Nucleic acid binder design. Structure first.
Length: 60
RNA sequence: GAUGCAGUGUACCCGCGGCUAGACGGAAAGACCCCGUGAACCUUUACUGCAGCUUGACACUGAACUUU
């Protein structure tokens, strides 16, 4: 899947970068636990337009 | 393989008790044998399928460190 990260991941990236992962990785680990969101156009717009400042605010 | 054909012999008409030599006696469209481009079930290194079992590829299926 194409996903947008919600946090730091060692080999993927961090804090809003769009990166393609294997479908099982996104479906079973990241998305259910909130570490990323599927990179739909609506999801990307909703993430970047508003919420991103607080997402950056949480350092740890 | 004749009561019924030919020739011939014998023989008045009709029961009853017995008998089983013949009526190729009765019974069952021969089961033995052969035939039909018939049937069924069984067998196998007959033919052709399938179930079952098994092999690999793709999908469900992800992450981080090493080696040739």
């Amino acid at each position: 899947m194409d996903v947008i990260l919600l946090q730091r991941i060692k080999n993927l990236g961090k804090l809003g970068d769009k990166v393609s992962v294997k479908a099982g990785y996104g479906r079973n680990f990241l998305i259910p636990q909130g570490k990323a969101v599927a990179a739909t156009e609506a999801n990307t717009a909703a993430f970047e337009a508003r919420r991103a400042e607080l997402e950056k605010q949480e350092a740890e």
